[PDB]
């Protein structure tokens, strides 16, 4: 599923991501924009052989099981495929664990490089929330 900007902001808010660990909703929408262009089916293969999955490009090295990332963990206790669902519940629940891990949203290299410090409220501007 390719979400609309305000459609995703609403789904993220409903699942309690708005101000989670102090990150305003526009931070999460900005990260999703640059990670996946709001596409739940986004995938990216890493040089190390891990894969990133879903709207927030959650990686198989730590967070999900894909059966093909030697040495990896599955700390969100999900198949990585769950992160490609039209239903963002698994992605949001796992994102909550990741952003709690010590480095906040720096865990998402695209958030640090493209969202951090910018006017992220622009990502929810005009949305009925
Ligand atoms: Na894994």
């Amino acid at each position: 599923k390719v979400f609309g900007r305000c459609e995703l902001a609403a789904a993220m808010k409903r699942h309690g991501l708005d101000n989670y660990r102090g990150y305003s909703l526009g931070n999460w929408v900005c990260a999703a924009k640059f990670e996946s262009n709001f596409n739940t089916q986004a995938t990216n293969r890493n040089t190390d052989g891990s894969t990133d999955y879903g709207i927030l490009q959650i990686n198989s090295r730590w967070w999900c099981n894909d059966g093909r990332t030697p040495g990896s963990r599955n700390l969100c206790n999900i198949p990585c495929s769950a992160l490609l669902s039209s239903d963002i519940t698994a992605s949001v629940n796992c994102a909550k664990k990741i952003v709690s891990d010590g480095n906040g949203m720096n865990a998402w290299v695209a958030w640090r490089n493209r969202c951090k410090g910018t006017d992220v409220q622009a990502w929810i501007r005009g949305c009925r929330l």
Side-chain angles (χ1 to χ4, degrees):
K1 173 176 172 167
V2 181
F3 275 78
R5 183 179 55 90
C6 290
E7 184 190 16
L8 182 64
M12 283 176 155
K13 183 168 181 184
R14 170 160 94 74
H15 289 99
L17 211 47
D18 57 308
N19 220 38
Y20 191 91
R21 272 302 218 267
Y23 292 94
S24 68
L25 191 52
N27 282 284
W28 295 102
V29 172
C30 184
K33 173 68 178 178
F34 293 122
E35 289 294 3
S36 66
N37 210 8
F38 306 151
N39 186 355
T40 74
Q41 298 191 261
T43 64
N44 173 69
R45 175 63 40 78
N46 298 134
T47 61
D48 74 347
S50 67
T51 302
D52 302 333
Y53 298 86
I55 53 156
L56 288 168
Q57 282 301 93
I58 294 175
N59 73 72
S60 62
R61 170 78 180 82
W62 291 107
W63 305 109
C64 64
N65 178 56
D66 65 7
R68 57 147 286 124
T69 310
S72 78
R73 300 293 289 280
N74 177 13
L75 298 176
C76 293
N77 306 117
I78 46 171
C80 294
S81 61
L83 303 167
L84 306 188
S85 183
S86 64
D87 178 340
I88 69 166
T89 298
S91 285
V92 166
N93 288 344
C94 188
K96 289 180 176 168
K97 291 193 192 290
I98 299 168
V99 75
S100 294
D101 182 72
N103 298 310
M105 289 197 67
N106 295 288
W108 288 276
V109 168
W111 174 87
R112 176 164 60 71
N113 288 330
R114 305 182 70 171
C115 296
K116 186 180 189 183
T118 76
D119 180 26
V120 294
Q121 106 70 50
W123 291 100
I124 66 160
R125 189 185 173 279
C127 307
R128 199 178 181 82
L129 299 167

